[PDB]
Symmetry: C2
Subunit: 370 residues, 2 copies
């Protein structure tokens, strides 16, 4: 074990995009409290804030909506590629492959195009995900356009093939805002390391997706879903959690490496998951989640992080569990691409060295003398 | 000091580049690339039985699945060849997934055996209108690549120099692409993701492409006298000379001395009268004028050109070689891991009140 393992606390670069765990608002995007943005904005306002630098006025926002709405369809060649990705593929590999292939079809030929490419990814990723999913799981080639004006509603229209409820559109917008940006985590760092070699925007995103695929980084809301779905009463969940804690099982969705007393994103999504539970008539899943939440506080003094109540919220909107991390990609692409533009404008980055722990120099031995 | 490695040392006393203690110069002289890939992935040089078994294994992993061939056919002719390599690795991860780290060395072997066909199947389909057989009669990866690229049995000399090149580029400690592979590995992601990410970082012109830029320099000149005259002009303007110097090596890049001699042999075999002489004039002038040595990339440009390799496939060849080092680095990260999560210095605005849409 090396003292500098993981680069914990070592400055790898500079950012104006966000601050996590600082005094005042626990999470800000260009100085705005994420809880304010999630309550009062659509995700396009927040993507615009990250990528273009300021909250848009009504005419900037309308223009941006129109632009994204014209960028939702997939090229024919990309549809043909997604049809050949197996049904049992990891959905994050589908996202990774879609980004990789789109980079060959619509290349970033100059960094002048970088915001057009980021906007294209934000507009097309919901179709990359759902065109593959419904082709392989339902045997249907879907329309990649929809009548929904926002990314969040468009995703639900593609997934379910019907007009989403206004509550469901709202909570999708809330979720995409909540996950949009989180400073220098593993996938944002991967995107910036790639950006530092002056590689193209599709490479940076494809790299970031691969890092988010690892279970120490992505998939915590899927793990929370796999816990809460086990129980048919909140009292069964409590009794079983008490046994898991005695075994020192790690309970995903609880605690945080940076937040000290609460994750600002939790209070937001918890409230919206409660509204969804009431709308859809749920009598078990939200109550199960609350009981686990209460038991984790009483036994371990751990608060729920952003991943815990996202599990139930997505489930109430009909979203298959294996599409949760792909939804995170649709959101966090805004922060990732914004971090790439910062790296390109101010290309300063840490260059780590290694400590050699191998063998001393040794003479070469010929093949037959081995 | 991000991490620890046992794979290689660069610029230390004695042999300037070692792989698990072995001087890269002795490996490139005496081994085929598969012996060095085995050293990096399995930990020691293989014996005759082990090498024969490894070659038979890799020979049965060269073909591409039909779904992958169909995907490669949809990548445009004018695509960046590194995006073809990135896409091929990504798609192969959905067809033959790494479902447990127990499979890690098998997946690394599959990528080493399949990368040559991913590159050439795409290339020959889009540039020569042909769907090629992805198997060949060549026993080695280096020969197999040339057999697929040109559709003919390569000469013994060309097979040798391909093997030398794959060995020389196989591993180089920490750098942008190896680091990217390790950051990805640190989240416990799968092996295909770590290689896809590393390819993306190598695509950036501050990391990848130096041997292509060297090619674009040496191809300009019709004679060594002209090259010398123009180089002294560039040196007066303090132009950067592609293929010279190194951030670590002090007096010589050990890989340069090896590939220079193999380039010289290729130039003789193909009857070159200009490219090697031009390269040597630039080499000699750089030492006289600047006491700068050529690094690995400089004579690799002529060697690959004499083997009939299009310039835009040079970095893809580096991917076929450096996949050995990348995957070996991922195994080290997995065996002794902490998620890599650095800090940022915040330079943005102070916290501020939300402004509603109508007041913006
Ligand atoms: Cl666009």
């Amino acid at each position: 074990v090396l003292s500098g393992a993981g680069l914990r606390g070592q400055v790898a670069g500079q950012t104006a995009l966000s601050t996590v765990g600082q005094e005042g608002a626990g999470l800000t995007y260009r100085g705005y409290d994420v809880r304010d943005l999630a309550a009062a904005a659509i995700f396009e306002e927040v993507a615009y804030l990250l990528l273009y630098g300021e909250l848009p006025n009504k005419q900037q926002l309308d223009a941006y909506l129109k632009k994204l709405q014209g960028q939702r369809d997939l090229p024919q060649a990309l549809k043909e590629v997604l049809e050949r990705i197996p049904k049992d593929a990891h959905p994050m590999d589908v996202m990774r492959t879609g980004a990789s292939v789109l980079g060959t079809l619509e290349p970033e030929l100059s960094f002048d195009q970088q915001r057009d490419v980021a906007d294209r990814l934000l507009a097309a990723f919901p179709a990359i995900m759902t065109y593959w999913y419904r082709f392989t799981h339902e045997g249907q080639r879907i329309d990649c356009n929809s009548d929904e004006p926002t990314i969040g509603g468009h995703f639900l229209a593609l997934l379910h093939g019907k007009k989403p409820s206004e509550l469901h559109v709202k909570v999708m917008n809330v979720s995409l805002i909540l996950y949009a940006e989180h400073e220098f985590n593993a996938s944002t760092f991967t995107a910036r390391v790639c950006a530092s070699t002056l590689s193209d925007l599709y490479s940076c995103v494809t790299g970031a997706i691969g890092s988010l695929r690892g279970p120490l980084h992505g998939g915590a809301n899927e793990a929370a879903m796999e816990l809460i779905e086990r129980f048919s009463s909140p009292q069964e969940a409590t009794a079983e959690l008490l046994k898991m804690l005695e075994r020192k099982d790690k309970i995903m969705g609880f605690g945080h490496a940076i937040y000290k007393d609460s994750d600002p994103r939790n209070e937001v999504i918890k409230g919206w998951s409660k509204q969804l539970a009431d709308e859809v008539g749920d009598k078990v899943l939200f109550a199960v989640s609350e009981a686990i939440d209460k038991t984790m506080w009483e036994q371990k003094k751990l608060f729920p992080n952003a991943d815990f109540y996202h599990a139930s919220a997505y489930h109430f909107m009909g979203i298959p569990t294996k599409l949760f991390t792909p939804i995170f990609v649709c959101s966090r692409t805004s922060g990732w691409t914004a971090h790439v533009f910062e790296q390109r404008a101010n290309n300063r980055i840490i260059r780590p060295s290694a400590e050699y722990t191998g063998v001393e120099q040794r003479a070469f031995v010929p093949l037959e003398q081995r």
